[PDB]
Amino acid sequence: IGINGFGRIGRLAFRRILELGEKSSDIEVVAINDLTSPALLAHLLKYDSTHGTLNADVSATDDSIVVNGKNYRVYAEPQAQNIPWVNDGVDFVLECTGFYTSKAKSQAHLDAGAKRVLISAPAGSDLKTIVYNVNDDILTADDRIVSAGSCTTNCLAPLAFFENKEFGIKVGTMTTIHAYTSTQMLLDGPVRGGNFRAARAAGVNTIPHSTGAAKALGLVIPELNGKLQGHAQRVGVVDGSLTELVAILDKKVTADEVNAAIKKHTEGNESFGYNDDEIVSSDVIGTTFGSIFDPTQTEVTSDGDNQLVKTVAWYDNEYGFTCQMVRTLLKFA
Amino acid sequence: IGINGFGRIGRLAFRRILELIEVVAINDLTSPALLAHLLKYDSTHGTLNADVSATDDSIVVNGKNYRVYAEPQAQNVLECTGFYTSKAKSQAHKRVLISAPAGSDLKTIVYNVNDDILTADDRIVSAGSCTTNCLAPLAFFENKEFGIKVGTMTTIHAYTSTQMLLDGPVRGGNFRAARAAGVNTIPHSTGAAKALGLVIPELNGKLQGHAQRVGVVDGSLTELVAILDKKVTADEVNAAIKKHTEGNESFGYNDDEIVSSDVIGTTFGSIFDPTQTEVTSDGDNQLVKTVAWYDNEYGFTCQMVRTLLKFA
Amino acid sequence: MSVKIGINGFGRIGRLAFRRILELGEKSSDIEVVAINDLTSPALLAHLLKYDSTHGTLNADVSATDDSIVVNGKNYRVYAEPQAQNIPWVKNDGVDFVLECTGFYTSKAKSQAHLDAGAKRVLISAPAGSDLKTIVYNVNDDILTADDRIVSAGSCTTNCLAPLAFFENKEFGIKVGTMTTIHAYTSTQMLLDGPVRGGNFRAARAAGVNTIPHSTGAAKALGLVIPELNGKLQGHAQRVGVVDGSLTELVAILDKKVTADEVNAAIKKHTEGNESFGYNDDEIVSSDVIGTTFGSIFDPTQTEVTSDGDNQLVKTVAWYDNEYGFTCQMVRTLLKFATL
Amino acid sequence: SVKIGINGFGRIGRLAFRRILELSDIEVVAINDLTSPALLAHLLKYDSTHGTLNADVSATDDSIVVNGKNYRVYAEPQAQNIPWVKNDGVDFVLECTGFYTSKAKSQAHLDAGAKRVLISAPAGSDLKTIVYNVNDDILTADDRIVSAGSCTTNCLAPLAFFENKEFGIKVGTMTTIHAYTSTQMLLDGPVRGGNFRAARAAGVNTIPHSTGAAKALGLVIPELNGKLQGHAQRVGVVDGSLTELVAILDKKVTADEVNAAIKKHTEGNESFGYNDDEIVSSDVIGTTFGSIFDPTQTEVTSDGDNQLVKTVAWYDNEYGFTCQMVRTLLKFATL
C-alpha cells in the first residue's frame, strides 16, 4: 500500500494497520506522500492530541519515516501521477488527501501504475461507495477506484440498513452533531470554497454544515435511494460524533421494539456496535466500530396514525471510520 | 423587584432592566463584593458600561444602591435560583415570575405566544425555559400555517451552570450531566417539547424532543422535524413562517448563514433560520425540518423581562 | 493479609488512584482498596470510574449494586457520609488507612476525624498545612517514619516543581527563584461565571474560555519538601482552557555561570531511571503528558539562560499530568507509607 | 482626510477597518485580499470574538458596502499590482497579510504609489519598529516603511520601558500566555514552517512557541538590546493574552513600590492602561490599550541581596494591538 495524505485519516490508517499486526498480514504499507518533511510526519504519527502517543519507536530520515525498524519512504509530490512508489512495490493507493475525490482525479494513481485506489471520502455517484458490513459484497475483482464513503455514511448506513430491513423506512431526515475537522477554520477567516459557515471559528461555534451522507445513501443501500436527506452541526470537540435519524416507518412501533430489533443486528458486529451505558462523545474516541447504536436516545412520537421514530448512533469519525476503511482495504485483497 | 439568584439569568435580567422598570434588591449565597464583580465582568457578554462597586451589604451601580441578602430560605420577585421551580416552593415569596418551567398547575408564559392568558389574579407564573421560548413561536406559526400532526425536536444547546467542568458527581446523579461539558456532546433531557401543551394547548401530546449539550458557553439552536397537514416546499415553509417574524421582538429572522456565537447578546427568544429548512418527500410521505437560534441566556432573559413588564 | 484502604472522595484523584492501584496489580499487592466514601449513588461512581472524558474507558468489568461498586468480580463498599468521623469502614470493611481525596479535610485537625473513626493512618491528596510532612516521592520520601499518622502527598505542582528545583539546586545552587505553572482547569473552577466557594474574583470565572491567574503555595511552601530552598521561591498559576496537562516554568538566579546545554545535561542525568522525574526532548505539548506516570517531565527544549555580564536568569520547565502523574506519585508514597 | 488601503482583511485587517470606522480624520477607501467580497463583508459583519458590527453591511461583485459607503475590494496577490492609489487615492497602506513582513517586500506598496506603509508585525532591523507611546517620537518625514511590532511587543514594551526607567533592568525573561492565532492548527497536521509544536491542535493544548518580542525589544528600547529573552505558551482561548516579565533590577524594591512606580506611567495613557479589579483574559477582549498593567500579580522574591521582580500586563492581541497600529497610522499624518 501507498498512503496519499498522511493527515488525520492517513496517520490513523497507518496506526490501525500496524496495531492489527497478523490480522493485517495480507497488506503492508510501503510508502507515504504528503506536502511535508518526513521529520514532521514522523512527529505527528508519534504524538496525537486526540488519540495519544503511539506505543512504537518512531524516527525520520531525509526521505522517510522509520517505525519499529521498518522504513516507509516519504514523497512530497502534489501530483499523484508523479509518485514513483510503484520504488516501493505499491499495488493499491489509500487516497486520504481530500484532493482526489473523483474517478477522473484518482485515475492519476492508476497512471502511476496502481492496481486499485480506495478513496477515504465520498468520491461521486459514478463508482462503488463501500460501508463494510453493509455492501462490501458488491465489490468484484474488476473494481479499480472505490470510495470508502464518509464517516457519517459509515455511521448512518448500518442504522438505516437494519432499521429499514426490520420496519421499512418510507422517508427520513438526519442531523449529525459532528466534531470539527481539518477543513474548518481555527479563527474566523477566508476558507477554501468561500462558505459563510465553514469560515467561522470551529472551537467556539455550533456551525450548520452540508453532508451528502443521507442524500447519497442510495449508493450504499439502493432500497433507501432518494428516501433520506440531512445535514451536520459542527460543534466544539476534536473528535466523536453522533447521527440522529428521524423517519416515517411502514410499521407502528414502540421505542423498546425499535431498540430490540436494531440491537440484534449489533450482536458480533465489528462495524455496528451497541452501547446502553449513557455514554457521551469522548467515550467513542478510539472505538473500532463505524457506528454505535444508542438505544437510550430512541424516541417514538405518535398522534393518532402519525408516527415519527428517532434513532441515534455514535461514531469516532476519525478512528471508527478508519477501522471501516481498513476492513474495506483488506477485502480488496 | 427582587432578584432571587444573581446567576447567569439574574445578572442578565439586572443588565436588561438597567439598559431599558427598576430592580431594588438581590438575594444569593455570596458576598456583595463578588456579586458586584460578576455583574461588572461577564466572560460571555463583556464588561458592563457603568460604574459598579460594593459595600458590606449591597452593590452600587451609577450612584444607585442595590441591597444584597444571602438568605437561602426565601421565607426571610424574579425567581432565578433554579431551587424554587414550583408554585408550592415559590409561595415563599405581590407577584413571582419563575425563570424556568415550574409545573402544570400555574401559567407558563412565552411572551408573544400566550402572554394574553395573564390576568390580575395570577400571583405565581413560569417564564418557561430558554428552549420553550425558542420552540414555542416556531411551532405556533408552523402549526397555524400548515398543521403539525406530530413533531420531534433536537436542541443543540450551549452548556449551562448545572453541568460539570470535569467528570464528577452532579446533583440529580444523571450519568450524562456528570461529564466534562467543554469536551463532550452530551445528550440531555428538556421538557420543552413534551410540555409545550402548557403554552400551545393544541400541540399537547404532539411533540417530544431532547437536547445535545455542546462545548460553547452560550448560543443554541432548536431543530423541529414534523409531519404537516399540507404538502409544502422549503420556499413555501420559509415565506409563511417569515411573515410572522415581521416586527416581532420575540421571534426574529436571519438568512445571513449565522453560527451560534452570532446570537450571543440578541434580544429575541427565537430567531428563524430559513437556510436550514429541509423538506424530504417520497410519494405521500413528507418530513419538514425547521430551525431557530436562541441566546438561551440574554434572549430568554429579554422574554422574561417582557413578561415582567406585562405584570404592571 | 495486606493494608486495607478507604478512599474518601472518589473524584478525579480518587478514581485515578483506584485505576493506578488496579493497573499495578502485583506491584500493588501489599495494598488493597476495600471501600469508598463520596456524596453520590454507587451507580454514578461506577459510571465515572468506567468512563473518563480525560483518560478514556477502563479496560475492566465495572458495575454497581445498591451499596457498592464491582470491578473484575471484586466488591467495593460505597458510603455517602459527608462527616469523615461517621464513615463505618473500619469496623465494616477493615480499613487500615484513609486515602483522603475530597479536598475538604486538607488539615491535621480536619483529617483527625479519620483517626477518630478508627483509621491508623491518613494520606492527604493535597497540601495540608506546614504542621505535617509533605512527601514528593523520589525527593524526600525518606523523612517518613512508622510514627507518622497524617501525611500530605503535596500538590500536583509540588510533585512537578520539587525534583526540577531539587536537582537544579544540587548542581548549580538556587539563590532565589520564581515559578509560573500554566495549569489545566480543575474541579474547583467554574464552568460559567458565578458564585464559587471562597469568593475569589478569579476562581469565579468560566474556566474553558479564560486564562485565570491563580494562587499555588507550591513555591512558597517548597521548604517542606526541600529544606535548603525554604523561603527562596515564590510563584503562582495561570489556569488555562484544557481539561488536564500542565507545565511549571522556574526562573532562578544560580551560584554558577551556566549555558542552556550545561543546565540540560546536568538535570537530564537525574532523570536516568527516574520513575518520578522523566525527560522529553521531542518538543511535546500539554496533551502528550495526559496518562504519563511521572510527577514531573523535564523539557530541555524550553531551557533559557539570559546573561548581561555577571547577571544571569535561568528558565527551566517541566511538564506534568496534574491528574495521573501526581496520582502515580501519591500511590508510590502510599505503598511506602503503609509498608512502614 | 488620511486615506488608507488595507492589505489583508484578516483578524487584524477587519478590526483595523472597525477601529477606523468607529473613530478621526482617517478613512479606509479600499481593501485587498484573496477572497470574494461576499465572504469579506460576511466576516466584517459577524465576528466570533468581537460580536456583530452595528452597521448595514453588504457586498457587490467587486466591493463591500457599509452604511451606504462603497469600499473597493481587490484580489491582487502582488502588492505592486493593487491599483488603489490611482483608483481610490490611497495615501497609507496598512499591511496585514503576513506576506510583506520586510522593508524590501513592503517596498512594493511604495512602487504601487503609496506615501507610507505600516506593517502589522515585526519586519526586521533595517526600518523603525514603533510601539505607540513608547518610541513613536523617533518617526521622521523620511520614514516610508514602518513596523508596528507584534501584539507581544506592544504589551511588553511599555512595561519594560517604565520598569527600566524607574529601577533599571539588568536582565529579564518573559513568558506570554497567549491566545491561539490563525497560523496555528485546528487539529494536529502539516503547518507551514514544519514546527513540531505549531502543528498541534490549538484548542486542546498548551503549546510552547517562539516570540522575538523580548530578544528584538532592542529595536523599540535600544538600551534593553541583548538584556531580554522569552517565549510564548499558546493556550486554548480565541483572544486575550498576558505577558509575565521576570527581571533583576538595579534597585531593591517591594511589590507596593513597583506597583506605584509603574502605575504613575499609566495615568492618562491610552496605550498603557491599569487594572486592579482581578480581571481574566476575556475581560481585555475589545479593550483599546496595547498593554494593561495588572498590579495584583506583582511579585518580589528576595534572599539577602538576590532579588527577582515579576510584573504582568494583559493585552487584546487583536483589538488592543490594532488600536496601537491606528494610533501610529494617525501620527503618520503629522509627518
Ligand SMILES: NC(=O)c1ccc[n+]([C@@H]2O[C@H](COP(=O)([O-])OP(=O)(O)OC[C@H]3O[C@@H](n4cnc5c(N)ncnc54)[C@H](O)[C@@H]3O)[C@@H](O)[C@H]2O)c1
Ligand atoms: N477527519 C475525519 O473525521 C474524516 C473521516 C472520514 C473521511 N475523511 C476524509 O478523509 C480525507 C482526509 O481528511 P483528514 O481529516 O485526514 O484531513 P487532513 O488535512 O488531516 O489530511 C489531509 C492530508 O493530505 C495532505 N495533502 C493535501 N494535499 C495533498 C496532495 N496534493 N498530495 C499529497 N498529500 C496532500 C495534507 O498535507 C494532509 O496531511 C478527506 O477527504 C476527508 O473528507 C475525514
Ligand SMILES: NC(=O)c1ccc[n+]([C@@H]2O[C@H](COP(=O)([O-])OP(=O)(O)OC[C@H]3O[C@@H](n4cnc5c(N)ncnc54)[C@H](O)[C@@H]3O)[C@@H](O)[C@H]2O)c1
Ligand atoms: N442559563 C440558561 O441558559 C437558562 C435560560 C433559561 C432559564 N434558565 C433557568 O434559570 C435558573 C437559573 O439558571 P442560571 O443559568 O442563571 O444559573 P446560575 O447557577 O448561574 O444561577 C443560580 C444562582 O442562584 C444562586 N442560588 C442557589 N441556590 C440559592 C438559594 N437557595 N437561595 C438563593 N440563591 C441561591 C446561585 O448561587 C447562583 O448565583 C434555572 O432554573 C435555569 O434552569 C437558565
Ligand SMILES: NC(=O)c1ccc[n+]([C@@H]2O[C@H](COP(=O)([O-])OP(=O)(O)OC[C@H]3O[C@@H](n4cnc5c(N)ncnc54)[C@H](O)[C@@H]3O)[C@@H](O)[C@H]2O)c1
Ligand atoms: N485535580 C488535580 O489536578 C489535583 C492534583 C493533585 C491534588 N489535587 C487535590 O485532590 C483533592 C481532590 O481533587 P479532585 O480534582 O479529585 O476533585 P473532585 O471534585 O473531582 O473530587 C472531590 C470528590 O470528593 C467528594 N467529596 C467532597 N466533599 C466530600 C465529603 N465531605 N465527604 C465525601 N466525599 C466528599 C466529591 O463528591 C468528589 O467526588 C483536592 O484536595 C485537590 O486539591 C487535585
Ligand SMILES: NC(=O)c1ccc[n+]([C@@H]2O[C@H](COP(=O)([O-])OP(=O)(O)OC[C@H]3O[C@@H](n4cnc5c(N)ncnc54)[C@H](O)[C@@H]3O)[C@@H](O)[C@H]2O)c1
Ligand atoms: N492575530 C493577532 O493576534 C496578531 C497580532 C499582531 C500581529 N499579527 C500579525 O498580523 C498579520 C496578519 O495576522 P492575522 O491574525 O490577521 O491573520 P489572518 O490570516 O486572519 O489575516 C491575513 C489575511 O491576509 C490575506 N492575504 C494573505 N496573503 C495575501 C496577499 N498576498 N495579498 C492579499 N491578501 C493576502 C488573507 O486572505 C487573510 O485574510 C501577520 O503578520 C501577523 O503576525 C497578528
